[PDB]
Amino acid sequence: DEFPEITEEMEKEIKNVFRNGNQDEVLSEAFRLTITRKDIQTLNHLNWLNDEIINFYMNMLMERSKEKGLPSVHAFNTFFFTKLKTAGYQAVKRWTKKVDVFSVDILLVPIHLGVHWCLAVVDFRKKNITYYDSMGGINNEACRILLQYLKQESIDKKRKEFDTNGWQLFSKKSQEIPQQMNGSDCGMFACKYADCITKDRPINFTQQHMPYFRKRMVWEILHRKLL
Amino acid sequence: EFPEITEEMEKEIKNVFRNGNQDEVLSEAFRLTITRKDIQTLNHLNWLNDEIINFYMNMLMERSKEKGLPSVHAFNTFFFTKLKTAGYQAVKRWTKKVDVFSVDILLVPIHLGVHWCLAVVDFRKKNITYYDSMGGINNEACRILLQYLKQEIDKKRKEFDTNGWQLFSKKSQEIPQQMNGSDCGMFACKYADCITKDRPINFTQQHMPYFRKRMVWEILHRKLL
Fold first, then answer.
1. Which of A28, A163, B10, B117 has an alpha carbon 20 to 30 Å from B99's alpha carbon atom?
2. Is A191 tagged catalytic?
């Protein structure tokens, strides 16, 4: 335990933005994104997160990754995977215009499967590609789709072969990682998995920590500051 | 009792499992098409794909034509998922020719990533019920459907009277749990079988292998046992 606490004063800030008012009010703005009162509300109660929250959060992990001791990180926008599974390399090879995906330690790939979120992660240090689902599901397919994409990107941006030597692809089973009870927490699980993983910290929390993680993320998002 | 697959039936079942012509059309009904590859999804370590579940749900729909049995409407498997992600807007063109309220029961297969659950509106028992088989919670679904009925105005220019209708993700005890995830679709399909007949959910994980064999047979013959 010893999760950073949310002081009373922090709580007032949180309560305030869960209130009603200008639903368009830009609560925070960064990385080409825009979190409004409306997006922020998707964190309330037991509401489903929306893509804006997820992408904004993933970008904070990415910004945090700029410090040392820590593994450098690129985070793909959430639309990336689905525009890859359903339309292939061609539709998304553009998005990495100006990005050397091979120059970082870790890639985050939020995976939107219907109403559900999961996450895949390319860690180059370990030389492996891993899939995380807070519901137990496994999805070697998605890891192979990322290998293919990786393969095809090496050629394209690098004119070189992608070396799969030692490279392992796989899913983590329900006992390896805390599981959800509320379907709506799936997005929180994905964001929180990436938080530990990008700090190279063990995934320590469980489902009971979710009400608090939602409250905290509102806060973090609003200050563009991770605790 | 469970209804027996005789060796004669088991022999028909053995036949559809072979290498080659995976795109071969084996059964075909309710504008759906079930191929060898679809049918393989009923083998022991496999997850039922959507075409299987949609076909079975449509068989429960036809069965429901039988007198004495409650009238039943089953939504396709992409339905609930689109009602959520894209809102009522993207699903009301789906019942253009169906009058929902003219039936005892609505079946809504919920696909949640890889998992399958099931929601039931019994119009003649006034409530929605949600059966997950993996001990799971999703209470929204249950209101989104009360929401959905109210919104399906779009059909007969009347608000829908929603007096004391209830929403609950059904307990583990209360219903047989899986042991194998791969069987989640069967659980939804078979919860569903039980409900549409009115008889209680009287089976366990132990019966799942049999239930797969039997469903291959049921789908090949468009005949429920």
1. B117
2. no
**Whole-Å CA distances, B157 to B25, B151, B168:** 43, 10, 28
> Which of the 8 DSSP states describes residue B101?
G
Determine whether the interchain pair B115/A138 forms a contact, defined as Cβ–Cβ distance below 8 Å: no
What is the spatial distance between Cα B224 and Cα B31, in angstroms, rounded to a whole number?
18
Distance CA A226, CA A182 (A): 24
- Identify how the structure was determined: X-ray
B120: helix, coil or strand? strand
Give the whole-angstrom CA distance, residue A218 versus residue A220.
Answer: 6
Residue B70 carries which DSSP code?
A: P
Active-site choice (A39, A112, A118, A133): A133
Whether residue A184 lies within 8 A of chain B, CB to CB, comes out as yes
Q: How far, in Å, CA of A42 to CA of A51, rounded? A: 10
Which residue's structure tokens are 């920590």?
A: A209
**Given resolution (angstroms):** 2.5
List, in order of start, the domains of chain A with CATH numbers.
1-227 (3.40.395.10)
Tokens 């860690």: give the residue: A123
Residue with tokens 């039943």: B72
Residue matched to tokens 């964190």: A43
Which residues of chain A make contact with B138, given a CB cutoff of 8 A? Answer: 182-184
User: What token pair was written down for B13?
Assistant: 């079942």
The identity of residue B167, as a single letter, is: L
